[PDB]
Design a binder for this molecule. Structure first.
Ligand code: SF4
Ligand code: SF4
Ligand code: SF4
Ligand code: SF4
Ligand code: SF4
Ligand code: SF4
Ligand code: SF4
Ligand code: SF4
Ligand code: SF4
Ligand code: SF4
Ligand code: SF4
Ligand code: FES
Ligand code: FES
Ligand code: ZN
Lengths: 199, 583, 583
């Protein structure tokens, strides 16, 4: 959480003091974590942002109040309740907090948000405008579609839908009500054929 | 002492080492905002409003507790530091309750002044606040943590100045609240009800319960005749409520305003204080002629006797059985004036105005009832009186003057200095010296102990055979150390220890109205109210000895018989039991 | 006069006819709340906060509107009245936004005083408010109906005493609100930027355009040099928002404060006003000696000249080609000082203060330009300066005194009295008498027309051959009626017509900080402005005459030749055009 992400445009970066601070990140203890296309990069910023809220020593008002007041902007995107222009409200707290911290967390807390926006601005717009997760990770922003060719139509997933958003007749691929299920995902593993994919 | 050279805004200053930029710039007529800081007690700087940029620094530093250094340049008018102060301001305002129309503090809340000070306009934010729990179960103090903004000034003043410290900070983040221990209430722990906590909070997180609905019902009941008592120190700072200049006395205007309220009768404390001093001296001469329990202490302020009973009750034989002077005059009014006017004692109501907060606790006590009836009914402080007279709203500055009445309106300087530092026992020494050896003294010096301020020693002979030793301690820490040496027996030689609960004496009662941090910076306010009361005492042009008062001698002859009578033992003298400690 | 009897709280009183309970109670030291009432203007009682109990009545009646009768005993301390006003205050509190941390006046809003005075505890009544919109398009004044409580005083003060009448009520129920005609913005309708529209609204629903951000941007650039300017009448109003007693000159103190703010140059309106009076006397001589258009009329205020050009385009040939003094100072500063000091005109910024709110309109006007460059690019008000200095929040009360700079800050009393009502004509007749007949006069006899206050007439013998008549008209109704009689041509005899947009002089202007209606009850504030101004004028130790200043004639034979030179005709005089009317 003390540093930032290093995307594919910076593979020839000499990792030292003056280059990675010019890249807007700091080594700290030296932990190195590699990400791929299989996880959404939106909510993992909230994952490091989970760390700072539950550990903050509770003295300075930014590291108390400004932290959790910055969660609800992310999760309303993460459940599809956000509006356009909220990412520019994030940029208001971007330079305010870092100049107004006492505890060592406060200087280094929002820098994961700072690192990702200057490369991955477009994928937020997919979360904000298209209402679609590129990695299919954000639970409330994903929908399930079945494939007609691979589905047998046995109806095992029909027994495992708690909201009963799937219905139909035997021996044929069923129909999916997108808005009716809670997107729990209990039906995808119960199919022995793997006929359910994330859209 | 070391000299430090530094330039602020291009201006060079030589200061003693250890002083900070805040007070140095205040000396240079420059102001820095503050919520966190108060002198000599709280230097943590957690408010994060007093920011300023220092050249040669990685990030910004708070001017509150940043120490001075040689060769440093300070500039206080960059756009970035203004932006920092403003953004901290809306992050505070998104937590702190915005219905400031119905706040108790209302007018001079520090947060409103700072909100207008930085001139913020937009609140673009929606958030979730702390939990709303009303602890309306205590006797004096009600907390509303929906308003509390984690100043930690309250816990600091209860920690060091009080040396009581029944408050702490728990939880993480939003769960970090200031609370008593075990998630209990203040009535469920040993809170002294001092009043320093409720006066030093800058946003009105601490309030006192209204009793004014019962007062307004009482004045609206024709079957009840109302008597309203007055304090010697109620007019010490009341005029500051109306923007008056400093140390103003409005006693005649005060009396006229009270008589414009439809209140039936108005008395004061002064005769009760005089007679209380009388039996204090009488029991003194009794115990020095019989070899009584020594060292002896008073029983005046209820807060410290509650302190010494709940905490360390081992000195319980050293108390005096007599009540507070306001209790004495309440009982005297409830019996002798009642039989004088032939009015049933269940048909009038008594209300008294005290700047000390312990009286609304003391009225709830069960053993201080006489003739099957309570001694006093309703206790009122100056804030309550203040917006009550502002509620009836007679424009105060244009009233005429009025005097008090027959019998009980006369005043002497010995009970003018009743609220002052040690004037009660000073007058006690005057009375006992005049009784035994006819000595005329107008003032007695005190000795300051080096190492701790606030403790004063005096030892002046009453007779060449009998010398009496006097110490007066004010403030909870001072109480704790004198109690510690009393258990050590260091002052086994002395005769009198005088305990004032709140610091600076009975004249710094928590019931006095709120003062600003700026006003506490400029003039130390007990000095100005001390000058007002000392000019009042020198302005007492009739009597400066208590026992010469003919009215009290008349009441002695007609109803009180002889000093320390068996009837005085029956009426004027009571007993306290073991109150439970839940600490 | 007829004498009528009543009894207030058991006290008998004889009053003349027309005396209401409210003013008689205030005379008899009794105070009653009001929002509805103001003297002589707004008497509707529609706030319903001034309720007093009258015995024998079916329901309660409002004190302001109720006329007295013979022998009625009334009381003002009942449970009935207090509960009724509590209910009505609870009700009226529901609409206005409780976000008082962003209310523009904040601590001076008297609704807050009523809230903290009447002991309102909770808000049990949530709900939904009117239809929201903000017309932030007008260049001077912005409305917000989320704070308005519909007291009708704004439309009353614009309708009658100003004789403008461009506001009204619309709708039924919640759709009732105060609007202009056909709900367009104030910028295209016949508003005059009166400023009395904003100064009397009790809730701050009327506001200025806070344009401090470009002040900060201009001072934030090191390459732009800033030249500040003080109006001759602002110094009698700063202590009002610093709580000072009446009429305290804070002149050198605010000079030192603005020097401490880091502004590059400081100057005053005095010298340009002197130049303008000399110039106006020169066209006086020119028009009299050539038999020009009579009467000639000055151009001191932008308000009434905009009023004429938007209302009465047939009256154009009687105007004065000269501009306001502030424009003249801006032009001379960007030409003569720029050429002398070799500083580029587009690299300088000039900001000036004047409480007259109509000035923000003329900065919008493009025609007041020198070589295509606006004469002054930015200006703030006295309230704007107060907000900025409380951003700076310097400890104002402990500053030393300083003087302004050379050449352009010199002082004469003849333009100390410039800010008063009619001092312009006084200085004009002084300079024309010294030029043409060597007469030294200081004060002029005034005969005011009977029945009308605000119109003033005189006849001064300037020369034994030519006697000049004086007409001074300040206040909207006075301007309206002198316009009506000059329209018929009744007053062709006179030569001077003094039209002044605000009533009571610019010492009763818009930009001055708010005073409550309570303080206007005792003493009219223009009286103490007049006394402070006259004490400033009578203590001027060097000069009392305008044209006798060496610096003005130095700049005359240095750069500007003589008044009404062709070059001065190109840079000091210009033409005016009519403006479109959509009322
Ligand atoms: S940033 Fe540091 S001082 Fe501030 S709340 Fe977090 S741990 Fe406490
Ligand atoms: S369990 Fe698989 S094969 Fe059977 S109906 Fe569901 S998706 Fe089709
Ligand atoms: S995601 Fe869950 S609720 Fe939605 S259809 Fe599948 S099993 Fe049912
Ligand atoms: S803290 Fe109290 S006085 Fe201050 S704004 Fe909030 S409610 Fe009002
Ligand atoms: S009681 Fe007052 S000083 Fe203490 S934490 Fe709460 S708001 Fe701050
Ligand atoms: S009243 Fe006194 S003892 Fe009680 S919590 Fe407050 S400071 Fe502590
Ligand atoms: S005034 Fe002070 S010392 Fe006296 S009872 Fe009250 S708190 Fe205690
Ligand atoms: S006008 Fe309204 S918002 Fe402004 S201070 Fe008064 S109550 Fe608050
Ligand atoms: S805008 Fe102001 S003055 Fe006009 S009616 Fe509303 S509250 Fe009254
Ligand atoms: S600015 Fe003038 S015309 Fe416009 S509303 Fe106010 S008083 Fe009326
Ligand atoms: S008279 Fe009034 S409106 Fe006209 S310029 Fe002066 S202050 Fe402004
Ligand atoms: S008092 Fe909080 S930053 Fe100094
Ligand atoms: S002015 Fe308030 S009721 Fe008449
Ligand atoms: Zn996603």
């Amino acid at each position: 959480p003390s540093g930032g992400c290093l995307p594919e445009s910076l593979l020839d970066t000499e990792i030292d003091y003056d280059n990675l601070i010019a890249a807007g990140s700091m080594m700290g203890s030296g932990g190195l974590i590699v990400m791929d296309e299989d996880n959404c990069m939106v909510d993992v910023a909230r994952f490091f942002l989970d760390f700072t809220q539950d550990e903050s020593c509770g003295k300075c008002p930014p590291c108390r109040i400004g932290t959790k007041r910055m969660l609800e902007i992310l999760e309303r995107i993460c459940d599809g309740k956000g509006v356009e222009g909220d990412i520019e409200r994030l940029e208001e707290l971007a330079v305010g907090i870092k100049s107004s911290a006492l505890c060592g967390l406060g200087q280094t807390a929002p820098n994961p948000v700072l690192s990702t926006i200057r490369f991955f601005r477009d994928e937020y717009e997919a979360h904000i405008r298209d209402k679609k997760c590129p990695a299919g990770v954000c639970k409330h922003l994903l929908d399930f579609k079945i494939n007609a060719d691979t589905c047998k139509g046995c109806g095992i997933c029909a027994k495992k839908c708690p909201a009963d958003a799937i219905s139909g007749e035997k021996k044929k691929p069923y129909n999916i009500d997108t808005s009716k299920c809670i997107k729990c995902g209990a039906c995808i593993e119960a199919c022995p054929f793997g006929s359910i994919s994330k859209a | 002492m070391k000299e430090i050279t530094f330039k602020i805004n291009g201006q060079e200053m030589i200061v003693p080492e250890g002083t900070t930029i805040l007070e140095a710039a205040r000396m240079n007529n420059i102001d820095i905002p503050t919520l966190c800081y108060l002198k000599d007690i709280n230097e943590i700087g957690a408010c994060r409003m007093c920011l300023v940029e220092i050249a040669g620094a990685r990030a910004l530093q708070a001017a509150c507790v940043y120490p001075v250094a040689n060769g440093i340049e300070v500039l206080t008018n960059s756009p970035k530091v203004r932006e920092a102060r403003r953004v901290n301001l809306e992050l505070i305002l998104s937590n702190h309750n915005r219905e400031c129309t119905t706040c108790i503090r209302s007018e001079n809340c520090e947060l409103q002044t700072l909100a207008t000070d930085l001139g913020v306009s937009d609140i673009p934010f929606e958030g979730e606040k702390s939990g709303k729990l009303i602890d309306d179960l205590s006797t004096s103090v009600v907390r509303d943590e929906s308003k509390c903004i984690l100043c930690k000034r309250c816990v600091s003043v209860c920690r060091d100045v009080q040396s009581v410290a029944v408050l702490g900070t728990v939880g993480r983040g939003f769960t970090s609240q200031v609370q008593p221990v075990f998630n209990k209430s203040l009535a469920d722990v040993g809170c002294i009800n001092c009043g320093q906590c409720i006066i030093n909070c800058p946003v009105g997180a601490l309030k006192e319960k209204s009793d004014i609905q019962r007062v307004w019902d009482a004045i609206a009941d024709p079957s009840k005749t109302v008597i309203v008592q007055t304090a010697p120190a109620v007019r010490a700072a009341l005029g500051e409520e109306f923007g008056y200049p400093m140390g103003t006395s409005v006693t005649g205007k005060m009396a006229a305003a009270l008589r414009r309220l439809g209140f039936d009768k108005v008395f004061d404390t002064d005769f009760g204080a005089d007679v209380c001093i009388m039996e204090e001296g009488t029991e003194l001469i009794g115990r020095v002629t019989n070899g009584g329990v020594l060292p002896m202490i008073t029983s005046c302020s209820p807060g410290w006797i509650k302190f010494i009973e709940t905490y360390y009750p081992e000195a319980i034989p050293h108390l005096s059985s007599c009540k507070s002077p306001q209790n004495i005059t309440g009982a005297l009014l409830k019996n002798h004036y009642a039989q004088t006017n032939n009015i049933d004692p269940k048909d009038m109501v008594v209300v008294s105005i005290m700047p000390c907060t312990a009286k609304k606790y003391e009225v709830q006590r069960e053993e201080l009832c006489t003739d099957g009836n309570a001694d006093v009914d309703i206790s009122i402080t100056t804030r309550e009186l203040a917006r009550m007279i502002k509620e009836a709203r007679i424009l105060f500055n244009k009233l005429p003057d009025e005097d008090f009445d027959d019998y009980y309106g006369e005043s002497t300087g010995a009970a003018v200095i009743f609220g002052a530092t040690g004037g009660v026992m000073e007058a006690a020494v005057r009375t006992v010296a005049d009784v035994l050896n006819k000595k005329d003294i107008q003032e007695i010096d005190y000795q300051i102990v080096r190492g701790v301020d606030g403790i004063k020693k005096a030892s002046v002979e009453v007779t060449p055979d009998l010398t009496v030793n006097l110490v007066v301690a004010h403030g909870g820490a001072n109480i704790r150390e004198v109690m510690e040496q009393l258990k050590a027996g260091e002052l086994a030689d002395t005769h009198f220890i005088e305990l004032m609960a709140c610091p600076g004496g009975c004249v710094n009662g928590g019931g006095q109205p709120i003062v600003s941090a700026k006003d506490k910076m400029d003039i130390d306010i007990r000095t100005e109210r001390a000058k007002a009361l000392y000019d009042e005492d020198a302005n007492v042009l009739t009597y400066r000895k208590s026992h010469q008062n003919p009215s009290v001698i008349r009441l002695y002859e007609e109803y009180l018989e002889e000093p320390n009578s068996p009837k005085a033992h029956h009426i004027l003298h009571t007993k306290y039991s073991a109150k439970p400690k839940l600490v």
